[PDB]
Amino acid sequence: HMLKYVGVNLSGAEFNSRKKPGTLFKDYTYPAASDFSYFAGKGMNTIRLPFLWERVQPELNGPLDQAQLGLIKKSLEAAKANKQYLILDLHNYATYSGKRIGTSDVPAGALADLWRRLALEFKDDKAVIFGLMNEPNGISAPDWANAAQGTITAIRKTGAKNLILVPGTAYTGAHSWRSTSYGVSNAKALEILKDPGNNLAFEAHQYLDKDYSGTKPVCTSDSVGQEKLQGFTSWLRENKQKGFLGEFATANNPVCDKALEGMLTYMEKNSDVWLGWTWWAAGAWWKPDYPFTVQPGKDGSDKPQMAILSKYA
Ligand SMILES: OC[C@H]1O[C@@H](O[C@H]2[C@H](O)[C@@H](O)[C@H](O[C@H]3[C@H](O)[C@@H](O)[C@@H](O)O[C@@H]3CO)O[C@@H]2CO)[C@H](O)[C@@H](O)[C@@H]1O
Ligand SMILES: OC[C@H]1O[C@@H](O[C@H]2[C@H](O)[C@@H](O)[C@H](O)O[C@@H]2CO)[C@H](O)[C@@H](O)[C@@H]1O
């Protein structure tokens, strides 16, 4: 891989998110150790690991749940043994128990407390990357930037030097990074951020269906992926920052495969600012018809998109 980090999301611990705490093996699962080794064998050195804020910290501002922390640490052992980095993805959409950050129910400081606690646990783990928040939305770009700043500050106060992946609002879409239609863009709002540890990257997501939601197995053209990364890529370069494509996916059809090749090629060509990417998704709990799975079959076989991903890994 010409990029520093390439890999996949191992989805499952964030499943059935209505259920709190939920029960391990019933409502959610952590990955199998063999998942880590399978992806390592395909050249992937990075695993993004979604998990829920509510499951790791069952009361705001309170202690971490030790069983949940143990599950995360067990995944970290597997990643380390397979020479992989582990992105801790707080997979929460800027919400806690369905209430948005910035409401009276969930002050921005609560997110900083969560990350203070995780940083204290993982500050001495070089393999660990802090994915502050999956797809904030329903919060303005400046208000999210303030919440992100508080979180970065909290992490650095612990002495942690780990890479922090910082999203924007608007589901952190690459395509909409610079949009001012509805007010302040992510581009403008996030220029304010300061990381005293100088080890930050901006996390964007990009899907290729009509509304960039990844809800349909369509890529609207054979070039749309690279097209939608251009504005964000330029913003990174303009601001001397780095980026990370925390989620992206394409379905198994010719137009999508061309788009996939194009976007992977584009990131390699622009490796001065792209640190890497993690495909959405693998994990053992996707249904047979899920269009974006790269979890190997029970028969051991590779999924179709993996033949392309592996060429860039
Ligand atoms: O990106 C994955 C994420 O998608 C969420 O859907 C979002 C899309 O990300 C977002 O692009 C779309 O934005 C639209 C905007 O709200 C409209 O007002 C108008 O400007 O068009 C935009 C699309 O070009 O909004 C949808 C939500 O409606 C999924 O909800 C989420 O599950 C998923 O992870
Ligand atoms: O419907 C199956 C399964 O979906 C889980 O949510 C998925 C969702 O289907 C997918 O579109 C999105 O990209 O990822 C999420 C997982 O983060 C859901 O959590 C389960 O309750 C449900 O059984």
Side-chain angles (χ1 to χ4, degrees):
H1 43 96
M2 298 193 70
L3 305 176
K4 183 167 183 183
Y5 304 107
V6 297
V8 301
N9 283 265
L10 293 180
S11 170
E14 83 290 9
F15 270 39
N16 297 297
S17 66
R18 293 190 293 275
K19 315 230 176 194
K20 180 183 185 289
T23 301
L24 182 69
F25 304 121
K26 178 174 198 192
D27 304 306
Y28 68 93
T29 188
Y30 275 71
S34 57
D35 297 336
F36 293 85
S37 55
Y38 172 79
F39 290 105
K42 297 307 194 178
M44 291 172 169
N45 74 346
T46 302
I47 297 299
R48 183 165 181 260
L49 184 72
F51 62 91
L52 300 187
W53 190 355
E54 299 88 346
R55 293 181 175 143
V56 81
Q57 192 184 33
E59 292 289 342
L60 289 177
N61 301 125
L64 300 180
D65 181 89
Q66 295 303 117
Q68 197 75 191
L69 182 60
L71 288 161
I72 295 165
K73 289 182 173 190
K74 179 174 172 195
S75 294
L76 178 56
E77 289 193 23
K80 287 166 56 173
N82 289 277
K83 305 183 189 190
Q84 292 163 323
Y85 296 91
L86 187 69
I87 301 163
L88 300 183
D89 158 26
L90 194 73
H91 201 89
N92 270 75
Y93 307 92
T95 70
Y96 185 93
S97 288
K99 307 296 190 194
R100 196 78 65 192
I101 289 173
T103 61
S104 51
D105 297 276
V106 191
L111 180 61
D113 181 78
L114 176 285
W115 277 109
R116 175 182 69 82
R117 293 173 183 273
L118 292 179
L120 287 166
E121 297 295 335
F122 295 109
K123 55 178 284 282
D124 303 321
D125 298 307
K126 282 186 146 281
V128 177
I129 296 166
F130 301 150
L132 300 189
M133 182 60 67
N134 184 64
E135 299 188 0
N137 63 277
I139 180 165
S140 72
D143 288 346
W144 172 256
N146 172 256
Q149 181 65 72
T151 298
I152 291 161
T153 294
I155 290 164
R156 299 303 186 215
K157 283 174 173 169
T158 70
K161 299 180 174 168
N162 308 62
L163 178 62
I164 295 168
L165 302 182
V166 183
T169 191
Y171 305 92
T172 208
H175 62 96
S176 56
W177 197 254
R178 306 182 83 132
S179 176
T180 58
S181 301
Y182 243 120
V184 178
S185 65
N186 278 324
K188 176 60 179 181
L190 292 167
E191 283 161 20
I192 78 184
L193 292 184
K194 296 178 269 170
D195 178 4
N198 195 19
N199 198 23
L200 200 61
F202 289 87
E203 179 178 333
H205 295 184
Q206 190 62 55
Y207 292 95
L208 300 194
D209 59 342
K210 184 187 195 297
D211 72 340
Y212 321 105
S213 64
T215 55
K216 298 294 158 46
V218 173
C219 305
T220 57
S221 81
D222 63 18
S223 61
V224 65
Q226 67 85 11
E227 289 164 8
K228 295 306 174 179
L229 297 185
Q230 289 192 23
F232 177 72
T233 298
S234 193
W235 180 84
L236 296 170
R237 202 171 279 136
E238 294 155 25
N239 290 283
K240 320 303 214 253
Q241 304 300 311
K242 304 292 198 170
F244 195 104
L245 198 64
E247 297 184 14
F248 68 115
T250 55
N252 181 33
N253 61 63
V255 170
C256 281
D257 276 353
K258 284 183 77 167
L260 177 59
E261 292 267 15
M263 77 190 298
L264 295 172
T265 294
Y266 181 87
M267 287 184 284
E268 285 213 328
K269 177 64 168 156
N270 293 282
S271 64
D272 64 316
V273 297
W274 285 98
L275 284 181
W277 49 253
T278 44
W279 172 272
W280 185 276
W285 280 19
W286 296 111
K287 299 201 222 80
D289 69 347
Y290 189 59
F292 305 139
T293 181
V294 296
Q295 185 70 9
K298 181 163 165 278
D299 63 11
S301 66
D302 297 340
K303 292 291 185 293
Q305 297 96 315
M306 179 52 55
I308 294 165
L309 297 174
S310 192
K311 293 194 298 197
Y312 296 85

